């Protein structure tokens, strides 16, 4: 006999470009006559729901209000109310979106494969290490020349809470890089996706050669005629 | 009596991040009590523009407003009318503009300064080509410890038309920089702001190291028995 | 009512040497009976000023001053003051056009290694820094020929961030990236007035540029002191 309320968040909004409110009816039976909608912190005319669906399979109903609004809805800060009087409850019931902060940038990182991997000759991992943040909800994606990798390519932690920097969050990601796969050029550029940068975003990347750092034989010769000349 | 109306551009909704409608009422007959409207086609009580501008000293008449929009109005690609008349004109000076869809992504190289301007110990020049890229409207800025440079430590082009592909432009940037900072360290990476990234932001970096390892093969020889060749 | 007149631009100058002044006259009234008449600062009479031009594409007559002088005849301050006399005028319009440093400094960087990789596009860039004063040409030469001016194109000498007053500008050239093989150095001309022989050409080819192989090979020796 509840409603769970739905802000828009990062995911959906840069996921998307179709910033979103939601606030779907649950643990509740196989019902109609029932009305879903949204309002404002002043309370007025939005698109209605869409998506109808079935009833769950465990004796109750389901069913979504969704529509999209103006960033900056969210961005300036206000109350958003989802109204709905239900047929076993008359009474309005009512949910509630709205943001509230300090902020920090992440430091996005990166480190390649370690060599005792590239020994067994199959598989290289690459750990975009992103830290030294806040606010949360970091999206990040993988590019490869311009190119987003899938989501499903690689893996992403949640933003794990900062032991020392107190009030920071980080992440992590992975991308199982077969051995040649990684062997050939293929920067692999690592994307990022919060709030706390000028433009809001950042990438950086890697390759064999990011570091090698000026190998050099140096030869010393004496008493070792070869017929060459110098 | 012409009255100029800038359309939102790229290059200011990042810069600004404020998507703005902006009609400057100039050239018509100095009065004040005027009448000056922001609206959509169907026209609403479309939010009119405050911050006007005061008249021009030199015997002409200045007059400017800001209406701000959500960018995805701009976006649907039907026009937005700045509706202005005059204790004179009856007819409203009617604005209808719209940017026409249809578009190319840019791919920027970044290129650093060659030997000679550093031997000179005074300063030295960085330019990040811009390419490729249609339409026009893109933003440049470079970036340095994760904080934004200021503009006047590094002067940029105009979006000018390229040479042999039509449908493609091309832009610079100019960065002027000591000499001993180029020996330093920081990376001086490059932003950009084009309407066909998928992320819609770019990013590209250099630095001192940024080339290849250049492999030293040193072979001093001391030995007083194999020559030389002239 | 538009009537400029076009001080001398050291491109033609570098181009023939013939300094040259004009003061078109445009969107006057549409009669015929049209004088040209340019003057030096004594007020004395011009050269062959000739090739009378129709009427504009909005129906007015097109004049314009054909004026060629000493490049010497230029340095001191001339008001070249010319009149022109017409039928709407018993007071003709009059004009007048005169003569009003620092030194450039040209590099030519190569293409980036990511440019090299795409495999079409050989960017290449020619350029000028820190001079006074502008009216500076450019141009690209290759093999004592120069290119296709459309296959270049050049900047306008926007002014320095940090310098006083000082000017610069630019200039872009692409080619075959498989021509970036054969090479040439593509030589970039510069050409401002303020240098001794009045042109800093300045070129760059891929064996130009910056190795990543060296080897020096220092040797030692008493059998020396003599540089063969």
Redesign the interface.
């Given at each position: 006999i509840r409603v769970f309320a739905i802000p828009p968040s990062f995911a959906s909004i840069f996921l998307t470009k179709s910033t979103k409110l939601t606030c779907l009816v649950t643990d509740l039976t196989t019902y109609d006559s029932v009305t879903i909608s949204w309002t404002r912190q002043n309370g007025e005319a939005v698109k209605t729901h869409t998506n109808i669906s079935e009833s769950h399979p465990n004796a109750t109903f389901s069913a979504v209000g969704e529509a999209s609004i103006?960033?900056?809805d969210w961005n300036s800060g206000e109350r958003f109310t989802c109204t709905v009087t239900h047929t076993d409850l008359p009474s309005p019931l009512k949910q509630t979106i709205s943001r509230p902060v300090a902020l920090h940038?992440p430091?996005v990182y990166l480190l390649p494969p370690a060599r005792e991997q590239l020994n067994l000759r199959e598989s290289a991992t690459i750990t975009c290490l992103v830290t030294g943040f806040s606010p949360a909800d970091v999206f990040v994606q993988w590019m490869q020349r311009?190119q987003?990798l899938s989501p499903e390519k690689y893996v992403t932690s949640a933003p794990m809470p900062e032991p020392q920097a107190p009030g920071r969050y980080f992440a992590h990601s992975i991308l199982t890089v077969s051995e040649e796969e990684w062997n050939t050029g293929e920067t692999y550029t690592c994307?990022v996706?919060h709030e706390a940068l000028?433009?809001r975003?950042?990438?950086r990347t890697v390759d064999k050669?990011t570091g090698?750092?000026?190998?050099?034989?140096?030869?010393?010769?004496?008493?070792?005629?070869?017929?060459?000349?110098?």
């Open positions: 103006c960033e900056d940038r430091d311009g987003p994307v996706a000028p433009n975003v950042t990438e050669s090698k750092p000026t190998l050099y034989n140096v030869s010393l010769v004496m008493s070792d005629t070869a017929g060459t000349c110098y």
